[PDB]
Design a protein around this ligand. Structure first.
Ligand SMILES: [Zn+2]
Ligand SMILES: [Zn+2]
Ligand SMILES: [Zn+2]
Ligand SMILES: [Zn+2]
Ligand SMILES: [Zn+2]
Ligand SMILES: [Zn+2]
Ligand SMILES: [Zn+2]
Ligand SMILES: [Zn+2]
Lengths: 365, 364, 364, 366
């Protein structure tokens, strides 16, 4: 049978350990996939530290992958109806939803499925066939996985990264009920989520894209990938930033704001930048935090504002994200600062934790 | 023509009776005899000097129905009917500039920064003076959006509906799906929330639940269509959440209307809202202390929409009259007092004390 | 157990009564005792071999309500409730693949090319055989979308609603605004149009006008909420257009539903539609000769939306059940005949001749 | 003492436009006197010249596509962003003024459908002072109700003038689509200015694939140059070949979104067969009553669950968004301007547009 290896999380806050798995057969309808690129996410650090309550042990982490089909045990179609075969290059939606609940079937919001099963997050490696995350030479995909064939003209590293931060960013923009033509977009934060938001905002036809953050290196990147204006929170005052946005928008404020900071306190700045009638997509905050002092009359009622929380993404967002991403490979590849062998998965988590890396991608040896 | 009005000359001092002689009216204007004038809870705040838009002196009253006396030129209503002396009409209290970003580009006229409103930011010092409904007569500018009504319409109900009803309608109109199969929770049982009951019912909501503190208002909400009322003073937060969870199979409410006037209503409402739900916030009407808002739990993880609602526009006005017109007998139950115009000071006192739910004034 | 069903062996051959011995059912499947089975006009086309989807032999019947006999394993309804013996249920006739572009990307499961439908494209020759509602029992796959109902629900009405009702609902669901203040014109007064009357009313339409040729169906349309009916034998096309222009102040209808089954309906409907109006075309159910379409006048100059409507999905299912549940007394009037299952041929005959509006079959 | 202006006046249908001079002193309260710098010649100007548009009074100064420079404002005028206009400002404006009082303007919020819509160079004659109500002129007088946008010396006024008509109608067509264009396949029928602006708008909104079907190789080459992924020449392929091409690109589904930009009702016969189940078809090119086409209701509407949406002109929201898209694509869109003529050659301009020797002509005073 097949000799696979992976980096396994056995106990929280303890280094991932190398382990080998002999793969004999795979479940009916499943797809055995050779991982070619595996994204390391900020959230993987959180999971490693034992702060994500969905996470069983032991587990093969890694929810962002691109790979080559080794074997389908039976037949599997991709989302366009193409039958997969050995050697096909694919990406896939990390989440499988039930297809039977209120959100999957009635409201058509499958990202809200309470039964959502996610590779490298709530799928452990204890029970055979074990290989349920991307920090591995190989992953076994269930037959219910949403898959998309890609080609050798696709940058698999970029696609892997895009699966997570990109598709969330896409969801955030997709909730806006108008075209972006003529619109001013403000993005708070310049990690992968905010930076995909720059390229997504550009690609959907936004007039002006402004990014507010605190790292000059990340802000330079934002400019190289399409931002019209960047504002460094450490070099400018709140009022200076408000005036720059008010100047650009003829005194109205921004039409659409993306929170991509991870910090609930971002809404305090963002609310004062939003025009009357504007739309604030809140997608960065990823853990419970202290409550923020929210001014209901000023920020919601008087402003006639929409505040929209964004929870992950579904298959519609996945395919649309691949499509935008595929027009933007050269720019988006600039987000990958580090490329490491799988056996260095621990160092990769350190790099991400310390912010030495913007994004790290692992490759099996 | 000799008109009279009850005029606000000094905040916190009683409205005073005053006579006005109306000869010429401005070009294009419509002189209207007031038949019904609603006394709104916001008029109390204006009376008390709490509204910074309010010039003095001013004839208050932004909620009106009346009879056309004359048109200086020609005026069509929204359906294109030329107005003539004798016609009965209602009208939108607000006039927008029709030239700014919100009027012409984003098509959100309610957000017009140049919005002019009878009985609110239009004083009575300058001729022709009559720019509010606490008067025998009002002069409507040509730009006013008007609708003709008939003798089969209830003008008292229509006056009331103009304000609270049209804001309630705006709150429901922002919901991007139909209300079929949906559970609606309304927080509050003043005019705003009670209109919400009738609008929710009228748009097809499956369940309409009202949370408030007054048994008399809760009985009324039942009478006009609520499936369930929950008295906030006689139940726990946890009991009310359980009741809503039982009705929605453990999910929560699809749509919540905040109609209390208290920002703290979001603390409870946020925990009733299903994942993916929609919270329209329309009641809070003054700057208040900030509330501790749980961004992850209430917005992000919930994938929720919080939508603030500012007043209403002409599309909301027309839709509100249409709903109201199919519900006159239910909605007339909100009017607890009808007083002559000269007793306007008592009307304000009734509304302030909540001895009244809604007061209508009539001239003479 | 020994079930019985009425089987279609050859097109145009009378349905044959047959017994089926059921020993065990596939894993996760649900064995359901049929309590009400609706006979649809589309069953007549199937019976004659006009529907190219139809395998033979087949147990027809795609409108069903029933009582759970057994689940081989466990099955949750759409609200997550575990089904158990004795539960009353309704279900979506169609099961979609959950994997294709329509199911997963555009979220239009009604357009699934792999859609499997009880009594339509599921034959009865392979065990467990019972894949249609003209039967004492049906075996539902684990993938079926089910909803529990109660003894307070009218199951005869629910069976009917599953088809025509959910298609009507889809047609209204596509309209991008509220129905408040709107005038709705419905063409045709069979079950689709009649459900259209009730739905239009329930979503808050101001005026509902029905145009058809059957006096008795038009009387029923008034009994269930139409404001005006217009009979094509008794009125001219010009008289109809004037009546609709009078109600809409010269503009035309805001929303039209085609529910006649005839392509030529568009000729009249296009001239009743306001500029900017919305025309949902849901009745035409077979390929027909092309109609002469005036692209400039009816689409471009009118800035009109013509929207075709193909069946329905689980979202429309639940929402239809929800509106129907509030209108059982009105909608019961559509059921003109109830016949034992063994009389299924006569039921198809009644539906073909239009002596019935809707027939319900009951086992035993 | 007054301002000396001149224009090319249509006095009688099918007779040459005639040069005439005017002296402009007073203008109506609130009005803006504008020096024309660019005037687009539209294909519909030909039909109006010929006496085919029932809206057209005589005499009239044609030209509904314009950009220019503020000479004077009688009072005050703010552009749509709130900026006060002053003499010397460069502007563009919406050709159409709506009443702001009717059902469509106030209730349904569809001002393009206002029955009282007043359009420079179309239904506004030139015989009553101050006369200058069209762009085939040295100057135009804009009413206070006109929606205006200030532009800069870095904007291409020739491209903006053209964009005002064909471009805003194409924008309207795309704006009616209820989803994002991400991952979508767009087919455009026709490669005149309307269809060609469609290409740039489709690209700008993020469409994945943009395909153009037309009959002219030159125009199909232009469509490729401004961002089309594929062109199909309908004179050199069968309907079946074109459908196969679209089916191959869309994994056998059909187009997500089609724009009819041909002017021929018969285009729907092919487009309907290219549309996927659940697809959206904006019909914007057909501009005059035509014979009815044989429409297959079951196959093209019902079974397809298709949306067919007719597109009538545009409003100020479309205007502003068109100017924004256009402003990022000046160099591509300038490729559409094939001829620039002096105002006094307006008759030759119409000839060029009618013969189709020109794709788009711009007129310039002086
Ligand atoms: Zn689910
Ligand atoms: Zn991730
Ligand atoms: Zn009020
Ligand atoms: Zn304004
Ligand atoms: Zn049926
Ligand atoms: Zn499918
Ligand atoms: Zn033009
Ligand atoms: Zn108008």
């Amino acid at each position: 049978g097949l000799k696979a290896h992976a980096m396994v999380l056995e106990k929280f806050n303890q280094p991932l350990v190398y382990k080998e798995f002999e793969i004999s057969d795979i479940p009916r309808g499943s797809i055995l996939v050779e991982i070619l690129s595996a994204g390391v996410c900020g959230s993987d650090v959180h999971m490693f530290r034992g702060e994500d309550p969905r996470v069983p042990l032991p587990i093969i982490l890694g929810h962002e992958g691109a790979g080559r089909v080794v074997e389908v045990n039976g037949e599997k179609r991709d989302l366009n109806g193409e039958l997969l075969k050995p050697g096909d290059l694919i990406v896939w939606n990390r989440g499988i939803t039930c297809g039977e609940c209120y959100w999957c079937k009635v409201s058509k919001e499958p990202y809200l499925c309470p039964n959502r099963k996610v590779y490298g997050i709530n799928r452990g490696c204890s029970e055979y066939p074990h290989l349920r995350g991307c920090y591995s030479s190989h992953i076994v995909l269930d037959p219910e996985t949403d898959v998309l064939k890609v080609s050798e003209k696709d940058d698999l590293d970029v696609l892997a990264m895009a699966m997570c931060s990109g598709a969330t960013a896409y969801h955030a923009f997709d909730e806006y009920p108008e075209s972006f033509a003529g619109k001013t977009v403000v993005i708070q934060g310049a990690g992968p989520l905010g930076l995909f938001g720059v390229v997504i905002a550009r690609s959907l036809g936004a007039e002006n894209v402004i990014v507010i953050a605190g790292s000059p290196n990340r802000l330079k990147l934002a400019e190289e990938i399409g931002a019209d204006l960047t504002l460094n929170r450490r070099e400018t005052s709140v009022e200076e930033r408000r005036k720059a946005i008010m100047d650009i928008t003829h005194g109205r404020g921004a039409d659409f704001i993306l929170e991509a900071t991870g910090d609930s306190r971002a809404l305090l700045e963002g609310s004062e930048l939003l025009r009357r009638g504007g739309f604030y997509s809140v997608a960065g905050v990823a853990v419970p935090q202290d409550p923020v002092p929210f001014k209901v009359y000023e920020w919601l009622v008087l402003k006639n504002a929409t505040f929209k929380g964004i929870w992950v993404s579904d298959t519609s967002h996945f395919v649309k994200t691949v499509s935008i991403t595929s027009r933007n490979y050269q720019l988006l590849s600039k987000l990958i600062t580090h490329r490491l062998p799988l056996k260095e998965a621990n160092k990769a988590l350190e790099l991400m934790e310390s912010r030495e890396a913007l994004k790290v991608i692992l490759y099996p040896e």
